[PDB]
Amino acid sequence: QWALEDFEIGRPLGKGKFGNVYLAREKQSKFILALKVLFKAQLEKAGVEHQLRREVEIQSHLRHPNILRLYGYFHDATRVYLILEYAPLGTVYRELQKLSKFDEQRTATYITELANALSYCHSKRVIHRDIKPENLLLGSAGELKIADFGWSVHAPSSRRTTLAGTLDYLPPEMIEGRMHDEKVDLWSLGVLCYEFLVGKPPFEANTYQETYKRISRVEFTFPDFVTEGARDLISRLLKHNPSQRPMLREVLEHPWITANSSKPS
Ligand SMILES: Nc1ncnc2c1ncn2[C@@H]1O[C@H](COP(=O)(O)OP(=O)(O)O)[C@@H](O)[C@H]1O
Numbered sequence: 001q002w003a004l005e006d007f008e009i010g011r012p013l014g015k016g017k018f019g020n021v022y023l024a025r026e027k028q029s030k031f032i033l034a035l036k037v038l039f040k041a042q043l044e045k046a047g048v049e050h051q052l053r054r055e056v057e058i059q060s061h062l063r064h065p066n067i068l069r070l071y072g073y074f075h076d077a078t079r080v081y082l083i084l085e086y087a088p089l090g091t092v093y094r095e096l097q098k099l100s101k102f103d104e105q106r107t108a109t110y111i112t113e114l115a116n117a118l119s120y121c122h123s124k125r126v127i128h129r130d131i132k133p134e135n136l137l138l139g140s141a142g143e144l145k146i147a148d149f150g151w152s153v154h155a156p157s158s159r160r161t162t163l164a165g166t167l168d169y170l171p172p173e174m175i176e177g178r179m180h181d182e183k184v185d186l187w188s189l190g191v192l193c194y195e196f197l198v199g200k201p202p203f204e205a206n207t208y209q210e211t212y213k214r215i216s217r218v219e220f221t222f223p224d225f226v227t228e229g230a231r232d233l234i235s236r237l238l239k240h241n242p243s244q245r246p247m248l249r250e251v252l253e254h255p256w257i258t259a260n261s262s263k264p265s
């Protein structure tokens, strides 16, 4: 159906391991969107054809205001092209680098929007497994949208692919290569809540090897400015034992969240 001929390309929106994402406009409708380009040679070298297929399948079928739309795809013998909803206000990552830390109202509102989108995903037994600030995008009203479903699956599961980059958002079961389920996304939600309030993730270290140690032992401490409510929520999410982590309803209903968030469930 669609091909490159149908689009005018504009400025680079961002880079990923395989993906280079561009602003684009469809010629006959003037529709503005984002075009994620992947090189077939690199996809093959790394052998991640199955991840791409999962990304397209899972994401095109989901419909939620806090999840980024995927409309379609095409290819041309060197490249694959994913047609995405354009997010005009950029990444949460960029916003965090701009402001250094978020206040309690900003943080709690972002956490509600995430918890809503994840609740919807988990109701289809879909788990994301790569929740982090560079994969969270911002819509025209500043609302958070989850993106990049390249690592997502159906539960239960093991990991059949090599972990490439940062260990910082992964739970112990996942880095130790054990079987995992839905609870992995709740751990990452706790990591994120800490990084939003503090300015850096709670297990950050200088080497892979020591980050791995700090995660498996759950070694983290709070700066003085983190309030008692925030500590309570974060301490509940960052539990070594997956089954002791709360349900998403408990996160949405937590007193600190209800007091500080400016959006509902
Ligand atoms: N729909 C979009 N709107 C605006 N910017 C985007 C969009 N999708 C991706 N980006 C930018 O491009 C980057 C990489 O996209 P992503 O889909 O996460 O690629 P990868 O799978 O390689 O990580 C993002 O971190 C973001 O900066």
Ligand SMILES: O=C(CCOc1ccc(F)cc1)N1CCSCC1
Binding pocket: 040, 043, 044, 048, 049, 050, 052, 053, 054, 056, 057, 073, 075, 080
């Ligand atoms: O040449 C192909 C098949 C056609 O492109 C598709 C793209 C996405 C998809 F979900 C299904 C098909 N590939 C390139 C190497 S990775 C697998 C896909």
Ligand SMILES: [Mg+2]
Binding pocket: 016, 134, 135, 148
């Ligand atoms: Mg990404």
Ligand SMILES: [Mg+2]
Binding pocket: 016, 148, 149, 150, 151
């Ligand atoms: Mg990806």
